[PDB]
Write a protein that binds this DNA or RNA. Sequence first.
DNA 1: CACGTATGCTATAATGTGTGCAGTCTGACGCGG
DNA 2: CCGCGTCAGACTCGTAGGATTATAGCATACGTG
RNA 3: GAGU
Lengths: 50, 277
Amino acid sequence: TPEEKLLRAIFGEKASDVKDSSLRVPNGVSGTVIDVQVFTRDGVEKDKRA
Amino acid sequence: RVLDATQLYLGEIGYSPLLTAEEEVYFARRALRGDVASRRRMIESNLRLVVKIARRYGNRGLALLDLIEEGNLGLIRAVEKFDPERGFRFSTYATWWIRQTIERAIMNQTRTIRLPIHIVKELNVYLRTARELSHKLDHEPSAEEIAEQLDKPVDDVSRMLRLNERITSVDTPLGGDSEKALLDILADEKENGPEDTTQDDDMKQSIVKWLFELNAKQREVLARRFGLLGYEAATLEDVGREIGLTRERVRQIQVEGLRRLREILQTQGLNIEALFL
DNA sequence: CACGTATGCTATAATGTGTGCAGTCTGACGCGG
DNA sequence: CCGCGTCAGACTCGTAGGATTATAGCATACGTG
RNA sequence: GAGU
């Protein structure tokens, strides 16, 4: 919208290529992470945590 | 009485007499000449063959009647391109055309999202290869195992297997219980939120108020150039041409107006900074 | 020209379907013989 | 009359995702950067 | 599976 054109011209802050789909804790559940499991395909370079 | 489409059609085909070789040849000479009657009689006499073949190719592609019609279309191509002079029987030739046409039809129509023939046939070779692999490995094959067999890219194999992902109906009720379907859960992601709609009102209206704080000249330059209070995002030349010739002066007043807004923001920006989430 | 999508042709003879399920509920209210 | 058909059959809550198959092989034809 |  023209408003965000003007505002992003004012602040510069041109919006990046990447968004945000991070998995977060569902609201009002709260506890301790006791285990994590990672699954990667056969060919993709693995995560450091994996 | 007897109201099945299928039964009616099969009865009608039954009442046409089967041809011998010499008869087919005589008829067909005149059919290529354009006898009309000859073509009709050869078609109708050989409909029963179509049904025998469509019986085989059916199974899971399409409705039997659907297969029969496509098969008939193949048979017509065969009657148009038959060679009576060549000693080969008609039924032998027709079988090729009928099978061909049915298969091509089921490669297109069967898939909701129409898949081009090339993609479909590629995918099929991936499948048949998977079958051989699975027989001998005891295990159904991975994408990369199939790819290693073909000596090809895993990305290729993966993309094809993704396309094979078959559809789920939005109306299918969930959980073995005729309670509620997928539609009942599925959001409109594009449609925000009375929240979001009201926030745009608030945003747009706060910008009006902010624009009026500035000079009459700056505000008008900003409004016309942004296309905010104007209609069209008037270019430098357009805004200058309507006000002050100096195209350069539009840039100057515009950039000046942005910097006065920055001042308002450093002072009263305590509201503006919260627009960042 | 190439890349993506399409249209096409193949010749031993073969020529009327079936297939996968449905399981039978119940008290009422109309509709052709 | 008999018989065959069509129409109805409480309200909110929950759980969980998910299934199947297969369409040859090759040469020409049409549209876009 | 939860009250009706």
